[PDB]
Design a protein around this ligand. Structure first.
Ligand SMILES: Nc1ncnc2c(F)c(-c3ccc(F)c(S(=O)(=O)NC(=O)[C@@H]4CCCN4)c3)ccc12
Ligand SMILES: Nc1ncnc2c(F)c(-c3ccc(F)c(S(=O)(=O)NC(=O)[C@@H]4CCCN4)c3)ccc12
Ligand SMILES: [Mg+2]
Ligand SMILES: [Mg+2]
Ligand SMILES: [Mg+2]
Ligand SMILES: [Mg+2]
Ligand SMILES: [Mg+2]
Ligand SMILES: [Mg+2]
Ligand SMILES: [Mg+2]
Ligand SMILES: [Mg+2]
Ligand SMILES: [Mg+2]
Lengths: 563, 572
């Protein structure tokens, strides 16, 4: 028998973390390090089973690579340094250097250059379900920002871009099947691939109110993207006419949009933010301008050719030396550095701008009349109700928990690590690669974030640790004991996963009921002598308002249907 | 959606390293099962992983049947827990230590006693929860000084590790016996020829442990069996008793002999035509009493058992041998010139030495020996103890039969730990009566990676691997001849789906004509697939397939209409 006597705050702030602790599914060992207790492991394994099945069905080959990895491989890719401090670095007893793997691009590439020597082996897609380590600066949110976590990571190798796309498409489809079978409300979205436009990366998000990531959808089309990636187009069709002459105004204590809007009674749509960043050309600055009610999108900013990637903001001293004034008094008029303005900015008229002189602004600025319009680009974040960039409907912003991310890597790794195979024609080809990650331990948490109530966890059917809780009242009575054990055996025989509450009188029936519901068991059966005498059992669903009575004989028929 | 050789078999050119000297290591590389990342670190390739998972499944099934509860604990573990037990320092250089970005100290777990004890002292609060046994199948790291023998002495390896918690020794014994029985079912089901043996607890500690060994010619452990009883012990643990019942009558007088350049048993034997059984070795070690020495004596043909030596109350544990300088200062003579006559330090002799007569010993004078030494007459008998290793043909210590020594690969080890951890880490539960009880503990380890290699060490032939039935990565290999032809393709794919639907694991050899049938046939046999079916046009025209078993010498024809019945028969 599987029995309750065996199986069953402060740092816990999100609901999934709180309930995983309370339901006896995990325990903290240290910052970002959790043990799966017996009840939680059951859930984790059900996630793992569905992932494996769908990866297998998509033709991927399961491997299992080491956690500890030699530094030399990471030095080949440059990530030994470039990965940053989330990379856990160490030395062994021989003073040799290693990391604990946060991901396995380098290891799989090393494998690939030894094991792939014929075009007849391609395409091929290896995956593993394996424990990663990432030295997250502030481990939090329980399983969702852990240090040690389970990921399914897959890596595909190809002789052509078109081949990669075929596998990538299959992985996207597989992912959809995975999250559907896990019974999660989820959405795939376009994600940043490090260039303007393109479609070489997608995320899969579980929809939840606590979700850290903003995702954007058209209400009328298939348009879907992370806010990092979401294309912003202007609400206005044309630039307004010039109705005011430009003029220099004294503006002491005016260094924010609010101070400008409230101080001088300007509409926010007549103001701008000027952000100064480092240019790609060494020692240069670029000014990026968005309208006052908007925000600079730092991915869009870095993806501009003129702008250094990754994105570095100019210091105040850099700004003052270059421009002749500091933050708060900046603008495009008499600006001695390169400038890029957001699409919305290009359509503005009679607008205000810091004068590039301390504590002054120009009012009544108009493009063309008072200064040339600079380069225009999509620089801003979309906001709720903006037009869909495909021209079909308007945008809506939801919160999402990232559980999957897929990537087209081109030849980044194969070039650096000399992974090449001869074509049928005999041309050496650097293999084109994709990689595909699911946060498996994250998924367990994400499910609770999405699915919970006042009584505790609600699992999707695929994730429930057990299907049926048997709650005997006074299990010490032979009639009950026999009636319960018989029920356990039949149900277990019929392939159902049953938990038998074997706890003594010192655990009340109410406590028992609340426990089975906290843990998220979808069905309970209650056995008692009062009921055995009348040939009835007491059944209740997890999301049923009321219990009901079930003739002992019809039970198996009735339970089978539900499950 | 087929499992295909062009995908699974990978490169034709295999890692062929200088240090691949054991068969399992060689064959795991050649058969495309594992690949080396670095010293002691190996990737499971697709075919290899299939085998690992079958081992895990069976292990999981039997642990669960024995009432154990599966958990999964972290690999990275805080140093503080390890300082609680003292193993932070005492585990030694196999413990991989590190620091995080915040300067916090950790190890990668070589084992998880501290973590599970920390769990238990937060999770176990009532006697009603006990007994309880938690286990995991989880990846360990030990910084093996010289990683070798492929999977056998890796640094990263998979272990099933279980820990049980108890209010009484009798409770522990029940679970421990249940774990012993579960292990026996595991290794039987894996189809290995194996033996459980009595063992020493070693560094893990406690009193009472058994090892499970796979019998193989390359086994690193010497395991000892009676030819007439169920007596079985690691040579570390095996009790040695003398062949002689009594001390023989003294036939010679004791005499001092000049023995320059005579520092070995061999040199004494050869130089003086002495029987080796009339010579002794005297090994000087550090005493338990600080700054003391103790001499340990075994017969010239025998070896000192270092575990037995350390177990002697007079002898410091762990064992430390005295330096030549320490010996010369204490005794006034050096190694090669030592013995029990006029010895100014304590002395323990082996049981066999106590019964010696007319023997030769170093005189405790440089370059001299005494010949014709007899106990009582020439010197008193000192303390006697079991100090030596058993040798082939010795009396079984249970009184039944004589001993035979075999070679074994350790694949499991179970221990009784007592309150070692529970006392150190303050793990206590109140009894039914209200008394605090430091929880009594057991722990149980299987080397899951090791098992895979051990199976091959035991089971191989000239054509490659011989898997146990439960271990074969696939049951059937389909080898179509001219798979490119529609008629062969059609039948082959039909065969693949029908066999797969019945539940069989099938590998389809889809490789083109640059891989000859002969090579294909050798490849499937190397990988250890037990059955193959060849599809050909000449075959299909006659309504037959060509079947061959891994252990057969000849193929045989199979009427298509009897495929399932025939193959089903073969796989049972
Ligand atoms: N701290 C954490 N705690 C718990 N879960 C986590 C988690 F799941 C991820 C994760 C999940 C999916 C994903 F794809 C990525 S990724 O975007 O970094 N991509 C890659 O690693 C690529 C794809 C697979 C090969 N390499 C990261 C990251 C951190 C944590
Ligand atoms: N280098 C290696 N390469 C591959 N496999 C290895 C391997 F499996 C073991 C092993 C296996 C079983 C076992 F019991 C022990 S133990 O005797 O140390 N005991 C414990 O760890 C106890 C029991 C379980 C909880 N703690 C060690 C050791 C080294 C390697
Ligand atoms: Mg959480
Ligand atoms: Mg750029
Ligand atoms: Mg080996
Ligand atoms: Mg530990
Ligand atoms: Mg070693
Ligand atoms: Mg002896
Ligand atoms: Mg001692
Ligand atoms: Mg000593
Ligand atoms: Mg203990």
């Amino acid at each position: 028998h599987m029995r309750t006597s065996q199986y069953l705050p402060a740092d816990a702030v999100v609901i999934s973390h709180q309930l995983l602790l309370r339901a006896g599914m995990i325990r903290r060992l240290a910052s970002g390090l959790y043990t799966w207790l017996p009840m939680g492991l059951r859930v984790l394994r059900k996630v793992e089973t569905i992932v494996r099945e769908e990866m297998n069905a998509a033709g991927a080959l399961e491997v299992l690579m080491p956690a500890v990895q030699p530094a030399e491989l990471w030095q080949e890719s440059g990530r030994w340094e470039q990965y940053g401090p989330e990379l856990l670095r160490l030395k062994d007893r021989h003073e040799r250097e290693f990391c604990v793997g946060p991901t396995h691009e380098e290891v799989i590439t090393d494998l690939a250059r030894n094991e792939l020597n014929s075009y007849k082996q391609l395409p091929i897609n290896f995956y593993q379900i394996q424990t990663k380590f990432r030295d997250e600066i502030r481990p939090r949110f329980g399983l969702m920002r852990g240090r040690e976590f389970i990921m399914k990571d897959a890596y595909s190798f190809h002789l052509s871009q078109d081949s990669l796309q075929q596998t990538y498409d299959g992985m996207y489809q597989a992912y959809s099947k995975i999250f559907s079978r896990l019974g999660l409300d989820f959405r795939p979205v376009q994600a940043d691939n490090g260039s303007i436009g393109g479609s070489g990366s997608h995320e899969f998000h579980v929809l939840a109110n606590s979700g850290e990531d903003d995702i954007v959808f058209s209400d009328s089309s298939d348009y879907a993207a992370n806010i990092e990636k979401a294309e912003a187009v202007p609400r206005e069709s044309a630039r307004g006419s010039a109705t005011e002459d430009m003029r220099l105004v004294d503006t002491p204590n005016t260094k924010t949009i609010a101070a400008l809007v409230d101080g001088f009674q300007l509409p926010i749509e007549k103001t701008i933010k000027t952000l100064v960043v480092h240019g790609a050309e060494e020692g240069t600055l670029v000014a990026l301008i968005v309208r006052g009610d908007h925000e600079l999108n730092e991915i869009k900013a870095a993806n501009q050719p003129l702008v250094a990637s990754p994105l570095v903001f100019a210091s105040e001293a850099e700004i003052r030396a270059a421009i002749g004034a500091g933050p708060g008094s900046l603008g495009p008029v008499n600006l001695p550095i390169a400038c890029i303005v957001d699409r919305s900015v290009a359509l503005m008229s009679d607008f205000a701008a810091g004068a590039n002189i301390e504590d002054k602004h120009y009012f009544g600025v108009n493009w063309e009349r008072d200064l040339p319009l600079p380069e225009v680009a999509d620089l801003r974040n979309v906001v709720e109700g903006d037009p869909s960039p495909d021209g079909k409907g308007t945008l809506v912003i939801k919160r999402g928990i990232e559980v999957g991310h897929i990537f087209q890597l081109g030849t980044k790794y194969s070039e650096a690590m000399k992974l090449s195979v001869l074509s049928e024609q005999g041309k050496p080809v650097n293999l084109i690669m994709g990689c595909y990650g699911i946060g498996v331990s994250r998924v367990v948490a994400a499910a609770i974030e999405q699915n919970h109530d006042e009584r505790g966890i609600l699992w999707p059917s695929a994730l429930a640790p057990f299907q049926i809780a048997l709650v005997p009242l006074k299990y010490e009575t032979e009639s009950v004991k026999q009636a319960t054990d018989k029920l356990y055996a039949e149900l277990t025989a019929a392939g159902f996963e049953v938990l038998l509450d074997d706890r003594d009188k010192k655990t009340s029936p109410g406590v028992k009921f609340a426990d089975m519901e906290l843990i998220g068991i979808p069905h309970r059966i209650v056995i008692s002598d009062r009921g055995l005498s009348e040939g009835v059992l007491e059944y209740k669903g997890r999301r049923d308002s009321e219990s009901q009575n079930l003739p002992i004989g019809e039970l198996m028929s009735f339970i089978t249907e539900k499950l």
